[PDB]
Amino acid sequence: HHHHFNLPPGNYKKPKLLYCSNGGHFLRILPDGTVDGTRDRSDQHIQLQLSAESVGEVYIKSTETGQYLCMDTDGLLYGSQTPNEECLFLERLEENHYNTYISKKHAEKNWFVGLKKNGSCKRGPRTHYGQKAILFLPLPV
User: Fold this and answer.
1) For 13, 15, 31, 77, which has the most beta carbons within 10 A of its beta carbon?
2) Which residues define the annotated binding site?
3) CATH architecture of 1-141
């Protein structure tokens, strides 16, 4: 256990949008497996369905294409048709408000899911506690 255990309220009953306070982008997983951000609320690839594996463990999946969000050994986010160890994230509360997602596999290295102000996905090694890019607010669809 290298991380705290403060959990966010809410549930996984319904799909959500993942709003990043950083640049105001919605996490998007494109059909070809490309992960990025977009401010366009009409985009069909921003609706995400999360599910828990164990308390605090989640699977973030695109309801449209059915791809799972994952992070490779270089800290790059990608979409997979099937879920593997790289697609599990530790969902936590941050600043007593937001939701953060740490790569479970690379948990000891503090790699988070994050979005830059220009809408580009941050690379694992480039993220760390205290950033805005790692802060998410799950919004209804």
Assistant:
1) 77
2) 22
3) Trefoil (2.80)
Q: Taking a C-beta distance cutoff of 8 angstroms, is the pair 89, 101 a contact?
A: yes
DSSP letter (8 states) at residue 7: P
Resolution in A: 2.3
Q: Which residues face 99 on adjacent strands?
A: 93, 136
Experimental method: X-ray
Binding-site positions for heparin: 22
Q: List CB contacts of 83: < 8 A, sequence separation 6 or more.
A: 59, 61, 68, 70
Three-state DSSP at 117 gives coil
Whole-angstrom distance, CA of residue 129 vs CA of residue 92: 12
Distance CA 80, CA 86 (A): 10
> Are 110 and 122 spatial neighbours (Cβ–Cβ below 8 Å)?
no
The region that residue 100 occupies, defined by phi over 0 for left and psi between -120 and 50 for alpha, beta otherwise, is: beta
Contact (CB, 8 A) for 120 and 38: no
DSSP state of 32: T
